[PDB]
């Protein structure tokens with residue numbers, strides 16, 4: 371009749387898992403071989419709280435000219451996902467140092483969901499050994515929440531595209547936030 375439509379943009383450091391998160395949500399299977407730099411614009415059907423919502427998914431990047439093109443993704447958004455990877459504390463530090471200022475510049479007043487990706491790596495032995503070489507460790511859930519509070523984000527959620535853990539909750543949270551906007 372007239373489906374409810376909302377727009378989502380997802381941003382965050384390169385290789386933090388944005389495109390795979392979109393693919394798993396949309397297509398349902400983790401891509402083991404070919405991953406595009408950005409997912410195709412796609413409209414997701416999200417069932418939340420008894421409503422069918424169409425959520426347009428806008429993927430972004432920074433390599434090449436994608437940084438320059440990124441601002442063209444923000445207009446008329448309803449919800450922003452700022453992502454980092456749990457196996458990369460550097461990518462969490464970039465949330466405050468780079469991403470929040472960008473998002474607030476272009477999307478003042480929109481709800482932001484902070485998303486910790488690659489949850490499956492939190493106890494992964496190779497990840498733990500790699501990070502021990504620079505006296506680092508995986509991001510903890512508390513660390514993610516503390517960043518959420520610092521940036522005024524609407525919610526903090528963790529997920530793993532590889533195991534699919536927490537993916538539905540991400541998009542259900544984002545849709546609920548978008549419906550308020």
Ligand SMILES: Nc1nc2c(ncn2[C@@H]2O[C@H](COP(=O)(O)OP(=O)(O)O)[C@@H](O)[C@H]2O)c(=O)[nH]1
Nearest residue numbers: 383384385386387388389390405488530531532
């Ligand atoms: N272990 C693990 N690896 C992931 C996950 N999501 C993405 N990857 C890997 O991380 C890399 C970057 O993923 P991608 O979605 O392209 O990151 P983007 O640059 O943020 O779009 C790829 O090698 C993926 O296979 C995840 O949930 N867990």
Ligand SMILES: [Mg+2]
Nearest residue numbers: 389406407408
């Ligand atoms: Mg990508």
